[PDB]
Amino acid sequence: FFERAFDQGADAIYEHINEGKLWKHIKHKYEK
Amino acid sequence: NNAFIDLPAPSNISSWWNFGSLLGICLILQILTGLFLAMHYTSDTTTAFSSVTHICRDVNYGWIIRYMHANGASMFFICLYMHVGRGLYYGSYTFLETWNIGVILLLTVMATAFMGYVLPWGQMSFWGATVITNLLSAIPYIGTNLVEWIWGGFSVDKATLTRFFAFHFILPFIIMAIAMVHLLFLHETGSNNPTGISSDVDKIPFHPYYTIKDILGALLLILALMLLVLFAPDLLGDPDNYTPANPLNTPPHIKPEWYFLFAYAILRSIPNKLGGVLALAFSILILALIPLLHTSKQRSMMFRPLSQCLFWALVADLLTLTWIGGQPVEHPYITIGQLASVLYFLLILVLMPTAGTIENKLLKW
Amino acid sequence: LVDPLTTVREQCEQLEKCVKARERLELCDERVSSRSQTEEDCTEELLDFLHARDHCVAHKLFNSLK
Amino acid sequence: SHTDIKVPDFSDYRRPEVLDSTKSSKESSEARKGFSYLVTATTTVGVAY
Amino acid sequence: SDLELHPPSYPWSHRGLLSSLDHTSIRRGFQVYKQVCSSCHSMDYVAYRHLVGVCYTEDEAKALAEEVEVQDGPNEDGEMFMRPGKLSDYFPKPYPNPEAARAANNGALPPDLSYIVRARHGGEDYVFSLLTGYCEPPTGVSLREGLYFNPYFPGQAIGMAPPIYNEVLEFDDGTPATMSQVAKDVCTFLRWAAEPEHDHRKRMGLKMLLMMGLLLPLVYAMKRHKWSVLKSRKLAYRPPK
Amino acid sequence: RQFGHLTRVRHVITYSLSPFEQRAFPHYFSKGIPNVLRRTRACILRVAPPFVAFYLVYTWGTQEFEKSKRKNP
Amino acid sequence: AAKNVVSQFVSSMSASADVLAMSKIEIKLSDIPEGKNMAFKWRGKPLFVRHRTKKEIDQEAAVEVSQLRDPQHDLERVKKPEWVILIGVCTHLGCVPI
Amino acid sequence: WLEGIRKWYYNAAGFNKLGLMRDDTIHENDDVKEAIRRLPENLYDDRVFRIKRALDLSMRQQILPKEQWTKYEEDKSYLEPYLKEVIRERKEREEWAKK
Ligand SMILES: CCCCCCCC/C=C/CCCCCCCC(=O)OC[C@H](COP(=O)(O)OCCN)OC(=O)CCCCCCC/C=C/CCCCCCCC
Ligand code: HEC
Ligand code: HEM
Ligand code: HEM
Ligand SMILES: C/C=C(C)/C=C/C=C/[C@H](OC)[C@@H](C)[C@@H](OC)[C@@H](C)CCc1oc2c(O)c(OC)cc(OC)c2c(=O)c1C
Ligand SMILES: CCCCCCO[C@@H]1O[C@H](CO)[C@@H](O)[C@H](O)[C@H]1O
Ligand SMILES: CCCCCCO[C@@H]1O[C@H](CO)[C@@H](O)[C@H](O)[C@H]1O
Ligand SMILES: CCCCCCO[C@@H]1O[C@H](CO)[C@@H](O)[C@H](O)[C@H]1O
Ligand SMILES: CCCCCCO[C@@H]1O[C@H](CO)[C@@H](O)[C@H](O)[C@H]1O
């Protein structure tokens, strides 16, 4: 439990710090 | 093994002895990232700059390889200057062969980094190539001919960029060979140590003691490199090179890469063409004279307080020159730069050798 | 439509540092304009004023932008 | 006489678990080594990643 | 003059070490470039495909590209022709060459904006200050025709007239288009244009820090472990007497 | 250079402990800090002065440059 | 044999035949306003054609020539005073003077 | 008192803090190596231990307790008579090589 957990946890922290700013966060407003 | 494992090493060398391996790592890092950049770079003046933006924008991870190469060059010099400083302070230069090869290595890396900076063909690229090659025009009777021969024309142009790519590509490998000779000469004597006293009575195996220290060092170097690449990739660079080369206009605040600033300040301090170029050359070649200027009966500065003060004055002076090299040629910087330039040579040629003799008399030998 | 920038600039130039600089600028204005021939201009004074004011503007302007 | 040679006291350096000269240190050897092994295995995985 | 006015530091949402760009702001910034700056400034290194997954969906970007006409060919007759733009096309250049650009701007050359934020000390702080910093010349300053006074431009005389003002454009999300808002958004878009790797390097940076936070103390412990043999060794000198 | 052919040494005894028998960070702070202070006080008089000079020349020179470009220094 | 081979390789780095093809350049003086220094690319480097003012002309006339490091009277460097034409390359190390 | 600066310099130099004597710190050239080779067993062995002790202290970034520091007044050159003769012999060979 390293690369998976490490990568997901870090991505989670990153996305949390940048909540609402990333494309994946606003994408729904423009998108089958 | 005879380059690792059972190699006898002093029991007391400090972290200042870690820079040799960090330099090897910097060189391998540069060669690897460099080779990968060369797989996408084109040296035609019409496409050079574009190919670099292509690397950073469309090549997978091209941006990290590019900025690791750029900042890797900076880490290379930080390590070079620390390595040379260690040698001066501890009297390691008494290993004449190792030291002189060392001087050649410093000059070759400078030449390599200069040519590399020319490849993206930005404004700094073009004018750096212009100014540095013209240093040869200071040579009497044949200077101008030599410059045009190097350029492959009457000005920096297509022929210049293409040959610089070729020279920049191969020189690093020559550096690698020369570095291996640097090490073969060092192995004949073994390493110097902080006390400057022979350590034959207290040697320890290179492995595991220094293999582990070297790894720790490698990790710290990588931390420093990636902090720059991932959090401040342009911090040590120049914004002007983000502008394509324009042969009809030299930026008004043009300045050299940070690791060349001290030498630039020295050259700028002399209002004579030949005088400045000679001072520039001597600012580096004086390293080859240091061994001949050693007056102390002791090898290291560890036990020499006066020499130490002058040593740190020399470091503070290089810092002064670095600062001045980054300022405009205006008062009061012009005078400070001239005083700093004079002090540089005065410290190495007169003050340090004199302090050594004074220290000798104080110890009655 | 009102740009927050106008509002913020107005509040910021109320600060002592800005008023002082504004007074030096206005003083330069009177001096230079009262002259037919001169090579002086009030660029220095204006820049001192803008430096003090914009430092302040930069500290709060974005709270009004999306 | 070589018999006047006694190893100096190392009590200021010893790990707590091997401070009692009247106790065998074999009972803690597994724990003391297991830790270092854990440190080396974790480093290897970190570097591999 | 030779006097200098350096831009202040604005609290951009992407200023922090682990702070990403605000993609809605990038989207609005693109609109500013498209509607305003593109008439005079090129952006040679950015293509419609680069916008996908950053500030527009693929369908939206394709639609944006189809808004312009680009030259292509030659065809079977050896003729060049016009077609709707597509994702692979780079943003249209307003002029065929810099000479024409200068001819259309009183001799001044609007630089390519692809790297403007990286090509200028101050980055977006400079661009924002410049865009929102036009004012009347100070007393005693007289500018030649075609030049405008801007305290943030070196020398203070710039060949670009104030490009933005209130309502210079209408945003797709209703955001009030005040001058400062427009500048803030175009500067954010310009940051992305010059450094598209921006968000990813910071994410990688966080992982690098977490990994070093782990590995450094461990390797240091390995170092201390091995060296303890030497650090606690004791010596004795027993010469025969 | 090889162990066995380095130099001549007589009458020296060396005592050592296995790394597993000892602490890797003995008195890291209770002694580490005091020694660091000793080493710092011990060199600061040789190292610091030149940089204090740099600092002074820098601040004086920078301020001098500024004043020189103004109307009323 | 060695002299021939070495000089051939050395020669290969010298300006190639396409680089040596040179020609003059015609300039339209009317396009250049008084006080303006205009730069053109010519034979590889900048070519300055500057329309000088009376004041500039007079200032250059007042220079104490014997104190110059490269002593030349202004009138030995121009055909028509209002026009100064120079190769825009600093004689130190090649940059373009502003 | 030149002697005052001398004792001050001796301590500032600090090799005494590692328990070294001045001759223990001399840079070894070929004359010095020959002189050291000529040392009687006891002086050679003493030299070896003081150097080994110093290198060990250096590795630990430590120094001896003040009461064990070499004293300015007690530091005498054990190497001088041997080194002087080695240099004299070399100079003699050099003069003969000149003829
Ligand atoms: C690392 C080493 C590299 C250094 C290079 C040194 C060169 C070695 C010398 C080669 C000896 C072999 C004999 C060759 C005889 C060729 C005859 C010759 O030179 O004809 C002249 C003629 C010039 O004619 P023009 O244009 O009309 O005259 C202009 C007015 N000056 O030049 C030529 O033919 C050039 C042809 C060169 C072929 C040689 C290539 C081999 C290169 C050498 C590197 C390898 C090492 C060889 C080992 C040495 C063996 C003796
Ligand atoms: C034509 C009518 C223009 C429009 C629309 C915009 N710009 Fe411009 N810009 C123009 C010119 C002729 C110049 C050259 C100015 C000079 O005197 O050199 C510029 C320059 C800029 C710069 C560069 C400033 C510098 O530091 O050199 C920037 C950063 C800039 N312009 C930005 C910019 C933006 C973002 C615009 C849309 C909001 C914009 N410009 C519009 C001409 C024109
Ligand atoms: C590509 C650059 C270089 C590489 C790879 C390199 C590598 C090394 C290595 C591995 C060592 C042993 C470890 C150490 O003591 O740091 C060493 C020692 C040394 N190097 Fe370098 N070096 C380089 C450049 C130079 C330069 C520029 C100089 C000096 C002008 C130099 C002078 C020395 C000396 C004198 C030693 C002996 C140090 C001692 O034992 O005290 N080196 N070098
Ligand atoms: C001693 C090792 C080296 C040093 C010090 C060095 C240094 C540099 C420098 C300073 C640059 C400019 C970076 C920038 O700002 O863009 C550069 C560019 C470049 N280097 Fe190197 N380099 C080294 C080795 C190599 C090698 C071995 C290759 C190729 C086999 C290489 C390929 C390139 C390429 C293609 C560029 C242009 C792309 C770019 O600008 O990033 N380099 N190098
Ligand atoms: C074909 C290969 C050739 C001709 C290689 C020759 C290399 C020579 C030397 O290396 C050995 C040289 C790089 C080294 O001199 C010791 C440097 C410290 C020179 C420092 C240097 O840099 C500048 C620079 O980078 C610039 O960039 C934008 C601009 C510069 O002024 C406008 C300079 C400059 O005025 C000087 C002195
Ligand atoms: C690791 C600390 C290095 C010193 C930080 C400042 O670094 C300097 O920043 C300037 C402005 O950004 C640059 O123009 C300059 O080239 C750079 O060296
Ligand atoms: C490190 C010492 C700082 C250097 C001080 C320079 O000082 C400057 O020197 C000029 C020389 O022409 C003078 O004209 C000027 O008035 C003076 O302030
Ligand atoms: C910031 C405002 C400073 C005023 C300078 C403007 O100056 C004007 O610019 C015009 C551009 O179309 C020219 O046609 C006109 O001749 C010129 O006087
Ligand atoms: C003294 C100047 C000698 C410089 C070495 C190159 O010299 C050149 O070699 C060419 C190839 O053979 C010749 O065609 C050319 O005439 C000759 O000047």
Ligand SMILES: CCCCCCO[C@@H]1O[C@H](CO)[C@@H](O)[C@H](O)[C@H]1O
């Ligand atoms: C490296 C700087 C040289 C300065 C001369 C030092 O001089 C020394 O200073 C000591 C501290 O006050 C005094 O106790 C001592 O008697 C005196 O000789």
Ligand code: FES
């Ligand atoms: S002053 Fe050196 S190239 Fe002009």
